[PDB]
């Protein structure tokens, strides 16, 4: 059984980062070095494992998290980073065991006049716990005045559109990200290398 990684990396549609997609991988065999030797990835950073030693290890679960962010923000997808994305959208733990993979997707995810589709959370009353996901759209009450369900004075809709325009510089260009994490628990380790 080949693990269904091609459905993760080559999915036609990718999640907004605030509603990041998480796919559980199990009971299958995976060849990770083929990913490492792909030449289409402009980012491939692992933590707590070596990209080479991945094919000789087994785990209870592999998680594949995927989403779109802008190029300037790929650096926030790592343990111990700060910024709007790390704090409010997708947070990796300090002891993160896995790999962060990203690639420019300007050809697919930019649209002339702007892309409305991809969103990020700009306001939150607190930082996310690691691997926490928050899809709420309640108006952010920045002050003491009640918002009554509508943006306004000190009342902010919490999600913002990236507006990926094809002519942007790379830092403002969309990047598709896939984060693999590896979980070993007492339950059987069913996802293994070749």
């Amino acid at each position, epitope marked *: 059984n080949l693990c269904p990684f091609g459905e993760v990396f080559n999915a036609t549609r990718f999640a907004s980062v605030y509603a990041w*997609n*998480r796919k*559980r991988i199990s009971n299958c065999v995976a060849d990770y070095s083929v990913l490492y030797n792909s030449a289409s990835f402009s980012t491939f950073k692992c933590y707590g494992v070596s990209p080479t030693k991945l094919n000789d290890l087994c785990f*209870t*679960n592999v*998680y594949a998290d995927s989403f779109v962010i802008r190029g300037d923000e790929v650096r926030q997808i790592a343990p111990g980073q700060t910024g709007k994305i790390a704090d409010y959208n997708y947070k990796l733990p300090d002891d993160f065991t896995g790999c962060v993979i990203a690639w420019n997707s300007n050809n697919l995810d930019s649209k002339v006049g702007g892309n409305y589709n991809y969103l990020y959370r700009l306001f939150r009353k607190s930082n996310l*716990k690691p*691997f*926490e*996901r928050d*899809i709420s759209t309640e108006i952010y009450q920045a002050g003491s005045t009640p918002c009554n369900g509508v943006e306004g004075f000190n009342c902010y809709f919490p999600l913002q559109s990236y507006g990926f325009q094809p002519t942007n510089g790379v830092g403002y260009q969309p990047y598709r990200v896939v984060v693999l994490s590896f*979980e070993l*628990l*007492h*339950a059987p380790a069913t996802v293994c290398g070749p």
Partner: antibody, heavy 124, light 108 residues
Framework: EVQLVESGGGVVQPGGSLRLSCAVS????????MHWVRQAPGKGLDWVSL????????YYADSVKGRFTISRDSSKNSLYLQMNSLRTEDTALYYC?????????????????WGQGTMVTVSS | DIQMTQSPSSLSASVGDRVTITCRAS??????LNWYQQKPGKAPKLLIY???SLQSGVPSRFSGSGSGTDFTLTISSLQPEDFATYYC?????????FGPGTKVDIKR
């Protein structure tokens, strides 16, 4: 066989306190998120609270946030719900439930085994 | 909160009937939707998880389908042990929410 056994329910006065326990056997407790789900008399199912396997993440229904506290004791294979400032509408059978997947995450999963519940009756 | 509805609220059926009941989420929950079955005086039992996977020990006459907002539970030939109330539940986002249940009782 996996077993969950709730205790601690009884008749409390509005504003009172009560602690619920859930004793578990037959699986590696720490590998699994655990949940409290309650059922008002003649009503449907109502999710109350969760706690991840290592106890580091918890979540509450809005109706009980700030009044209830969930916690687990690995040494005693036990789950607790500390219920403060109880209201009449908290009256329900309280089930504890184990998440199906062994994982430190807590979303996108199912509750594969339920205890038979303990009755909480809040009345003046 | 993601609101879950179910239809019909109650259903009369006979042994051997084909039964289809539905569940709707107020917003997309992908396929992160579970079905539980509950009989009076007893705790719910997990029947279907992640929209279409049958729990161990659930027989093949049960199936589940749907992804996004609309889900269905189908029992191809209702058996006596299937008379019960059925609840759907979204796991996509906290707080978790349940549909209000569909009771399937015995036609006579």
């Amino acid at each position: 066989e996996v077993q969950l056994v709730e205790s601690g329910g009884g008749v409390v006065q509005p504003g009172g306190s009560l602690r619920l326990s859930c004793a578990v056997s037959g699986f590696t407790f720490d590998d699994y998120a655990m949940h409290w789900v309650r059922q008002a008399p003649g009503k449907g199912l109502d999710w109350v609270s969760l706690i991840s396997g290592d106890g580091s993440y918890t979540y509450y229904a809005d109706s009980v946030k700030g009044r209830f506290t969930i916690s687990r004791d690995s040494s005693k294979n036990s789950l607790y719900l500390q219920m403060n400032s109880l209201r009449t509408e908290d009256t329900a059978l309280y089930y504890c439930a184990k998440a199906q997947t062994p994982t430190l995450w807590w979303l996108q999963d199912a509750f594969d085994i339920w205890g038979q519940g303990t009755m909480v009756t809040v009345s003046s | 909160d993601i609101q879950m509805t179910q239809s019909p609220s109650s259903l009369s059926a006979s042994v051997g009937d084909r039964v289809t009941i539905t569940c709707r989420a107020s917003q997309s929950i992908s396929n992160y939707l579970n079905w539980y079955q509950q009989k009076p005086g007893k705790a719910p039992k997990l029947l279907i998880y992640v929209a279409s996977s049958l729990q161990s020990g659930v027989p093949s006459r049960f199936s589940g389908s749907g992804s996004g907002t609309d889900f269905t539970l189908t029992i191809s030939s209702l058996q006596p042990e299937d008379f019960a109330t059925y609840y759907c539940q979204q796991s996509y986002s906290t707080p978790f929410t349940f549909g209000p249940g569909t009771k399937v009782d015995i036609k006579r």
